[PDB]
Design a protein around this ligand. Structure first.
Ligand SMILES: *[C@@H]1O[C@H](CO)[C@@H](O[C@@H]2O[C@H](CO)[C@@H](O)[C@H](O)[C@H]2NC(C)=O)[C@H](O)[C@H]1NC(C)=O
Lengths: 107, 197, 123
């Protein structure tokens, strides 16, 4: 996993938590990074694609942005039922789909 | 010799255009000194598809076009006849037959501020391969498949312009490179640009 | 858009396995398929990408030259063949369908969109 992420994060329910995904200039720069969530014992789902868009059926709380060779995601109005692992995946310039280490969120 | 060409204006410039709308300057009616710019070694890559550079001052033309833009250091080779990719396919493609020189020099120090530049954008996802010497400033949202997006963004509808991630420290690969293409044209009118007598 | 998988039984090291992903609810020939894996105690790891036409495909470095990806449009099926497995290969493997319609050879806009059920594999 070329990408690096904080080992875990947590907070109170509703202080606009943030998660940062760090990577080199050949993975998350000059390309796009998509953020998915993995529930315990359930199939992963797409949350953010193209660094700003969102798919149908996903609330407006989740937001994402890129600030150069690194991306960030923000969840406002966090609820107790958002426990999951958040993965940031980008396309390496050469041949790869580099995945992030993960982010174990707790409330 | 009385008057020289304005190579300084197009070479030494602060506000330097992006690639998706590459700057074009028309040079004529002036004496051009190619020896002075060739001798200097500041230029990283100096290719000339056509006449030999050292004899450039021995040739006379009626018009020359100075295209100029900025690209990633890695993909500077794409500026040449035949080669295809993401710069010579959708942004700036030279014709298969060519006559000009392609100067390209590193500009990492002058660009790529500490927090990023973001002032250089390159086109992506063009509807069809670009014909030679065409610029497309259009920012209309791209589409594919069958469903047309009503000015919105999502699956099957992309934003064609993507920004660079220039940083002061990126390596010789992903660093800014300023490229200037000097394309001559003989046409039919009497030649104006010439070398020193 | 319903995706299911079958195969991936308990197999000892050095043997060969075939995983079959079945898709329904959309045009299977207009999308590029992705294979990924989730290993215990490790983050999601990409495995391979296969184009709808099958002419262009790519593999991850770890699984390179010891696997095969194939797709059958007529039967709407996706076959992954693994050979010469090892201890670390044990993981829950997943088949993913891109939502963006294929319109070229880019492979960075093609998203790992809505996921499959996925099946465990133990070496
Ligand atoms: C662009 O600017 C550079 C730097 O100024 C020029 O390179 C030399 O600059 C010093 C002082 O700035 C002059 O004394 C030298 O004469 C310059 N070199 C040459 C070969 O003349 C550079 O010349 C400028 N560009 C052009 C086209 O003249």
């Amino acid at each position: 996993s070329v990408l690096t992420q904080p080992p875990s994060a947590s907070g109170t329910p509703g202080q606009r938590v943030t998660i940062s995904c760090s990577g080199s200039s050949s993975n998350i720069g000059s390309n796009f990074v998509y953020w998915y969530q993995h529930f315990p014992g359930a199939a992963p789902k797409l949350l953010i694609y193209r660094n700003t868009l969102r798919p149908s059926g996903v609330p407006d709380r989740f937001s994402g942005s890129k600030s150069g060779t690194s991306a960030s995601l923000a969840i406002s109005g966090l609820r107790s039922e958002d426990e999951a692992d958040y993965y940031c995946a980008a396309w390496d310039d050469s041949l790869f789909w580099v995945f992030g280490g993960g982010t174990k969120l707790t409330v | 010799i009385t008057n020289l060409c304005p190579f300084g204006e197009v070479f030494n410039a602060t506000r330097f255009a992006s690639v998706y709308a590459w700057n074009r300057k028309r040079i004529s009616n002036c004496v051009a000194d190619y020896s002075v710019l060739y001798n200097s070694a500041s230029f990283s890559t100096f290719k000339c598809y056509g006449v030999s550079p050292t004899k450039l001052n021995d040739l006379c033309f009626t018009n020359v076009y100075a295209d100029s833009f900025v690209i990633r250091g890695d993909e500077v080779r794409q500026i040449a006849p035949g080669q295809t990719g993401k710069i010579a396919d959708y942004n700036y493609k030279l014709p298969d037959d060519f006559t000009g020189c392609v100067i390209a020099w590193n500009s990492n120090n002058l660009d790529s501020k500490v927090g990023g530049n973001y002032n250089y954008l390159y086109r992506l996802f063009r509807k069809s391969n670009l014909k030679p010497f065409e610029r497309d400033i259009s920012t209309e949202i791209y589409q594919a498949g069958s469903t047309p997006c009503n000015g919105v963004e999502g699956f099957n509808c992309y934003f064609p312009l993507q920004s660079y991630g220039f940083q002061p420290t990126n390596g010789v690969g992903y660093q800014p490179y300023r490229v200037v293409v000097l394309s001559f044209e003989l046409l039919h009118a009497p030649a104006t640009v010439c070398g020193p007598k | 858009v319903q995706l299911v998988e079958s195969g991936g039984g308990v197999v000892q090291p050095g043997k060969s396995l075939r995983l079959s992903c079945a898709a329904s609810g959309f045009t299977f020939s207009s999308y590029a398929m992705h294979w990924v894996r989730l290993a215990p105690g490790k983050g999601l790891e990409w495995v391979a990408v296969i184009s709808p036409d099958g002419k262009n495909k790519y593999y991850v470095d770890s699984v390179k030259g010891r696997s095969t990806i194939s797709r059958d449009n007529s039967k709407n099926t996706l076959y992954l063949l693994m050979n010469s497995l090892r201890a670390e290969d044990t993981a829950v493997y997943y088949c993913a369908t891109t939502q963006s319609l294929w319109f070229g050879q880019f492979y960075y806009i093609y998203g790992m969109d809505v996921w499959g059920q996925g099946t465990t594999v133990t070496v």
